[PDB]
Amino acid sequence: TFISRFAPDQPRKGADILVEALERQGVETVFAYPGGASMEIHQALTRSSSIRNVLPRHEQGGVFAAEGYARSSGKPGICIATSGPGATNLVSGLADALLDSVPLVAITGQVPRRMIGTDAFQETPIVEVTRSITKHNYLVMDVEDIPRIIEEAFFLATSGRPGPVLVDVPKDIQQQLAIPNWEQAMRLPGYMSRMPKPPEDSHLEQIVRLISESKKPVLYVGGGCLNSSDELGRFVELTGIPVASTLMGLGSYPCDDELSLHMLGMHGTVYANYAVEHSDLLLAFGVRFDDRVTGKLEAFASRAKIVHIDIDSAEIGKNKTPHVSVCGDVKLALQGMNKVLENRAEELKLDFGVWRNELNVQKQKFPLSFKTFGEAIPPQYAIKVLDELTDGKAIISTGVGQHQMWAAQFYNYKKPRQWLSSGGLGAMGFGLPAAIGASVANPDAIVVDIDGDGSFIMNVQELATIRVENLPVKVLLLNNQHLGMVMQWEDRFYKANRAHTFLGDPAQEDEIFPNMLLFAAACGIPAARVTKKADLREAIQTMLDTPGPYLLDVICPHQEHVLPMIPSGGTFNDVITEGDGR
Amino acid sequence: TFISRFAPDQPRKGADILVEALERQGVETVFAYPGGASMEIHQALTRSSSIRNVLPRHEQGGVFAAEGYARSSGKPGICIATSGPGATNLVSGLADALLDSVPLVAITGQVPRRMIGTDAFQETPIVEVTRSITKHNYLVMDVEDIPRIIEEAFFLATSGRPGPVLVDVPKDIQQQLAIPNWEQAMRLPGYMSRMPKPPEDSHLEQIVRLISESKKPVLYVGGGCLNSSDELGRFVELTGIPVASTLMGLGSYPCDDELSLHMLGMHGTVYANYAVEHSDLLLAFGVRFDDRVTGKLEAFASRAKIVHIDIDSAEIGKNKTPHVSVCGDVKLALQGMNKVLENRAEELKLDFGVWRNELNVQKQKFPLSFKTFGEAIPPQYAIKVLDELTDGKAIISTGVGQHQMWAAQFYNYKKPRQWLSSGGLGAMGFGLPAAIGASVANPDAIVVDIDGDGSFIMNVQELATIRVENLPVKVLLLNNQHLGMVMQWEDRFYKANRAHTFLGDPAQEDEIFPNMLLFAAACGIPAARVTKKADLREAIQTMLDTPGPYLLDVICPHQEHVLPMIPSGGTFNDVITEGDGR
Ligand SMILES: Cc1cc2nc3c(=O)[nH]c(=O)nc-3n(C[C@H](O)[C@H](O)[C@H](O)COP(=O)(O)OP(=O)(O)OC[C@H]3O[C@@H](n4cnc5c(N)ncnc54)[C@H](O)[C@@H]3O)c2cc1C
Ligand SMILES: Cc1cc2nc3c(=O)[nH]c(=O)nc-3n(C[C@H](O)[C@H](O)[C@H](O)COP(=O)(O)OP(=O)(O)OC[C@H]3O[C@@H](n4cnc5c(N)ncnc54)[C@H](O)[C@@H]3O)c2cc1C
Ligand SMILES: Cc1ncc(C[n+]2c([C@@](C)(O)OO)sc(CCOP(=O)(O)OP(=O)(O)O)c2C)c(N)n1
Ligand SMILES: Cc1ncc(C[n+]2c([C@@](C)(O)OO)sc(CCOP(=O)(O)OP(=O)(O)O)c2C)c(N)n1
Numbered sequence A, B: 001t002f003i004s005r006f007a008p009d010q011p012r013k014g015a016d017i018l019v020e021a022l023e024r025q026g027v028e029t030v031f032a033y034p035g036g037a038s039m040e041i042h043q044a045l046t047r048s049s050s051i052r053n054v055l056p057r058h059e060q061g062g063v064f065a066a067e068g069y070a071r072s073s074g075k076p077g078i079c080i081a082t083s084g085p086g087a088t089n090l091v092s093g094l095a096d097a098l099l100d101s102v103p104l105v106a107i108t109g110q111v112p113r114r115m116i117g118t119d120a121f122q123e124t125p126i127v128e129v130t131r132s133i134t135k136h137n138y139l140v141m142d143v144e145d146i147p148r149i150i151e152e153a154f155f156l157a158t159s160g161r162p163g164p165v166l167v168d169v170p171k172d173i174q175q176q177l178a179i180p181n182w183e184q185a186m187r188l189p190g191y192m193s194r195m196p197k198p199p200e201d202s203h204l205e206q207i208v209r210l211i212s213e214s215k216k217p218v219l220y221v222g223g224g225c226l227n228s229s230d231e232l233g234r235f236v237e238l239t240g241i242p243v244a245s246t247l248m249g250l251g252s253y254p255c256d257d258e259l260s261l262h263m264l265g266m267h268g269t270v271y272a273n274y275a276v277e278h279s280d281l282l283l284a285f286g287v288r289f290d291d292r293v294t295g296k297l298e299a300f301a302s303r304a305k306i307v308h309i310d311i312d313s314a315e316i317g318k319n320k321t322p323h324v325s326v327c328g329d330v331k332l333a334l335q336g337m338n339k340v341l342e343n344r345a346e347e348l349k350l351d352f353g354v355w356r357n358e359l360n361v362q363k364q365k366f367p368l369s370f371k372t373f374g375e376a377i378p379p380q381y382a383i384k385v386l387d388e389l390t391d392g393k394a395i396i397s398t399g400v401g402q403h404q405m406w407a408a409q410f411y412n413y414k415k416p417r418q419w420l421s422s423g424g425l426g427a428m429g430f431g432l433p434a435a436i437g438a439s440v441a442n443p444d445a446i447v448v449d450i451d452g453d454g455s456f457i458m459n460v461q462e463l464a465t466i467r468v469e470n471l472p473v474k475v476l477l478l479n480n481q482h483l484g485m486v487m488q489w490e491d492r493f494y495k496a497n498r499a500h501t502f503l504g505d506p507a508q509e510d511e512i513f514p515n516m517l518l519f520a521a522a523c524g525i526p527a528a529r530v531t532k533k534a535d536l537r538e539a540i541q542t543m544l545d546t547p548g549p550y551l552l553d554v555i556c557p558h559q560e561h562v563l564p565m566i567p568s569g570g571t572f573n574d575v576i577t578e579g580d581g582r
């Protein structure tokens, strides 16, 4: 049973009830930054012997760290901020967690209840601000509600389609004395009654039947499969269907595998987008048919029967209309379909080697390619060397931009939750704090933040967090001195007319600005810069072998372009396969 | 103490908890119309021996009756409707109660909690629909909340500025068994901490001082004074300040009194609007400076020091900027100012007989006047005869239109809560149901609905309610066969071009259509029609002397106009004092 630090008849502060509510959820780590409206919560945290606090240097760092914790572990991430300016600094993280379906519980202090609505000191209506960028939120109006609301928040954040839940706690409720009741029933009758049931054998056998009748099936795998790598891998054994993955699904099926078509979509491989373009059966498991993937919807999988299995009924038929649909956990659907495939194996005689051979011809004519100019370091090459020296077992977090795409293309993720990247919102500054959360959740792992120079500086203050918490976070900084992805679009569509994409100092144009090594130096983090491709392998090896945190500044020619590229709203026939800024 | 019909350890349905919650509030009458989602509440009502239900024939009749009950008694009116179409039929009454600050508690049944949001049978999101036309509303999500929410609803409806509160109760909560806790504390910390305090002697003596320094003071009295007739009357004794009343304030100060300037505003008396126009001190007690009263705001009381005493801080300075302000109960402000005036009486030497004489000259040159054409019945005359034959002691309710203004002008209300009229929203069909509620709340009173033919037919179905409940409701129907007030504006501003204002039958143009006597006949209510002014006095006398309900159809020439008239947005110099539709 659970052991409380208080007697069952002993009144204690609401802040102490809230912390014990976290303890009763199995919480061991929080990311909490103190302020006036949350001082009581922070005092109660020091009284907890089972919950560790990682103090960020910015609440956006706190929420992004909670995301990295969640994405790398499957557990909910918990961040805590004070009222007013603390709460508003969470907003980008809440939106990011909602768009990527990341389970997250955010607790904000609030001004006393009687002060609400009066423009009080450090008051913002955070429940109103965040209603459209959270899965649910609460304003606690009585200390007796703390056990129930915390329980509901964790249940909502982690069940169904996961997402962020914000709990706003007025300071007077934190100080009120009460005796908690941990037996209160949750008040989610509508939500709980609309929870998907395990899929029926009726629907599952229709799918297995559709597979046997098809000649060109393609698996279309996304973020919803992160807990189904075993079931999915078994499914691929029994069917031999090639696997195309989204940015969010990377690693659900191993990238180094022969049946892997790698990533599809705007910057997906030519052969992955080819497969979807010419398929007759599209198995869309745990995906939401977003515009980065589909392009022009009418042309996406235009001659395929579309099977869509999603745990969110609101996603089924939202953009692309499926032929067959299953609303439920893809993990269960895979388990059920795997049994059918095992028994009726010899009756089905599944063989797609002719389709696979057609795709492997595309895989040989159009592989992912990069150019090497003299001794300049290709960013693609740097990530490939990191893959080798870490044996593809590192947890990878990124910023947003060209380096993000290259980290997606040129690292072979073997398991899900190695890949931590902001996909739906695409928020710069995510990589460094996310690596902080992933390292705390996986203390023995290799954690590398593959960051861009614009993204890295946005939350550079979290270097102090990495040092103080003694986290072995590695930073592989692909430094092209530009806002690279926006620069690439300037080259393609605006005649290379630069509009504020250069991040260096124009007074000293040929100097690396700023000097990221001194940012690491300021926080006592060893660092180095590498410029010549000949030095890169030993440089990365040094970063990995040096215990504790390390920053490697990898200088790269800025004229590189992420390829291939299907322009926004385009079709497969519009794919760009050559060119850069030279 | 209170005696429950259940043992303190005996579980009972939520519906039974809700009814006992009403009993514990002192509720004796409700206006409840049954439907599927509220059947449990109606079953629980039959188990109550202290609460009577008056079954309307339309839920709009139910809410309007609850209004009449409230306006005529000072107690909150309680109406109950089922989900969906029952709840939506309350909407006009909720808006009407909010605009006129009438205390009201509306209970709606709702579909089961788990069905909410699914377009279920007879489901409408009534809490969303009514949020902007109620003072507050609730969606009960647990049977344990019923005692607390009902207590908060009555507290909010009746404290501060009164208003309607809607409580939405899902059917599954009505059926759930529980043991109520009647000791729960309310959760209104912000509202209760912002409640006005009793006025300080600091503010009150500044006002008494401002009175002594003024030569032309005018009292400007409205709906906020309905509980202050004694204090106000005493205040007028000590100061001799003449009293101008709004439509909502009629009867706070007696109309037959010599210091009474009667009603001000768009259809106010020439002398009341004169006083405000030339005053140097305007005592605005319990008023909200609405556009019907002020006209062009810059010209309203343009040379007066304005004292505004309102219980709602949001009203002070909303339209007209006062010089002095007191946020609090006008009843207490009057009591405090009366003490100062009593003690410092001989030191003040208050005498405004010169100003009063100037106003009494206006009162003699421009009195309220009407014309008599042959034997046709002037509506103004009919109301004056009703005043005499009832000695000004009848409770009067009205519809909306010309007859409403005439009932305001030509009846001398002696006490507040004799005058029940929809002022802010101006909802036709109010008069008949309001009379129903007033009669139930005042069983021994003379209750007369002075109604128009358009207004009366809108809720004519409540005649069945009057008969079945055996209520002595008198109907003085001023029948001009037109939508009279809109007709008057057609005459003045649209060259008498009729645009759907005629309510009779054009095929039989000179026939009274419809025959309201047969409407009364259908419901077993004695009725009569009078056409000649010579017959009017005996006709009204018959209506009054005949026990029980009675309808008197008073035929009137339609070309009458309500005078005087300050056009909308005009000034005192724009007042119209002559003309009609002839
Ligand atoms: C600069 C940039 C470029 C990008 N370009 C690309 C690109 O070329 N290709 C690309 O793929 N992405 C790209 N993206 C990422 C992108 O915008 C989206 O994040 C991604 O494409 C959508 O991922 P998804 O389809 O797997 O759905 P997700 O966002 O991962 O959501 C999961 C889906 O599965 C469902 N689900 C969740 N759990 C379960 C379960 N247990 N069972 C069943 N269903 C479940 C959810 O309801 C939801 O519909 C890019 C992002 C950036 C920032
Ligand atoms: C066809 C038609 C014509 C009309 N023409 C006129 C007209 O010529 N003249 C006219 O006067 N009206 C007219 N009206 C009515 C009108 O539109 C308004 O209802 C009325 O003028 C406003 O009443 P009020 O100023 O007393 O404020 P109310 O609506 O009665 O509200 C009361 C005010 O006092 C405050 N208050 C409440 N309780 C207290 C308390 N205990 N202590 C202190 N303050 C308190 C409230 O906050 C509020 O500000 C007409 C209506 C109709 C339908
Ligand atoms: C908080 C935030 N602000 C601005 C953004 C708009 N974007 C991008 C995009 C694609 O989302 O535009 O739609 S990418 C990008 C530039 C990235 O600079 P880098 O870190 O150096 O990486 P690289 O390897 O050089 O490309 C910008 C400015 C963004 N997403 N987040
Ligand atoms: C629900 C409703 N619908 C329409 C209305 C618009 N109005 C009016 C007004 C002033 O509010 O117009 O602004 S008054 C009026 C006509 C009144 O017909 P009567 O009952 O016969 O009385 P009378 O003695 O003849 O004048 C209409 C149509 C209204 N207020 N309520």
Ligand SMILES: COc1cc(C)nc(NC(=O)NS(=O)(=O)c2ccccc2OCCF)n1
Pocket (backbone or CB within 6 Å): A035, A036, A037, A038, A083, A110, A111, A112, A115, A120, A121, A122, A171, A172
């Ligand atoms: C420099 O002022 C500081 C500084 C610090 C460190 N702490 C606080 N704490 C409070 O002021 N607490 S409070 O009484 O409940 C309160 C009353 C009114 C409005 C807000 C409010 O809380 C805001 C949270 F700060 N104030």
Ligand SMILES: COc1cc(C)nc(NC(=O)NS(=O)(=O)c2ccccc2OCCF)n1
Pocket (backbone or CB within 6 Å): B035, B036, B037, B038, B083, B110, B111, B112, B115, B120, B121, B122, B171, B172
């Ligand atoms: C002709 O159908 C009728 C008729 C009558 C007289 N009563 C009811 N009652 C219910 O259906 N009750 S319910 O099971 O809780 C229910 C379930 C689903 C949706 C709404 C709902 O309630 C709506 C209220 F009617 N239905």
Ligand SMILES: [Mg+2]
Pocket (backbone or CB within 6 Å): A206
């Ligand atoms: Mg089929």
Ligand SMILES: [Mg+2]
Pocket (backbone or CB within 6 Å): A372, A381
């Ligand atoms: Mg090479």
Ligand SMILES: [Mg+2]
Pocket (backbone or CB within 6 Å): A401, A452, A453, A454, A478, A479, A480, A481, A482, A483, A484
């Ligand atoms: Mg860059």
Ligand SMILES: [Mg+2]
Pocket (backbone or CB within 6 Å): B206
């Ligand atoms: Mg003064």
Ligand SMILES: [Mg+2]
Pocket (backbone or CB within 6 Å): B372, B381
């Ligand atoms: Mg006469």
Ligand SMILES: [Mg+2]
Pocket (backbone or CB within 6 Å): B401, B452, B453, B454, B478, B479, B480, B481, B482, B483, B484
């Ligand atoms: Mg009429």
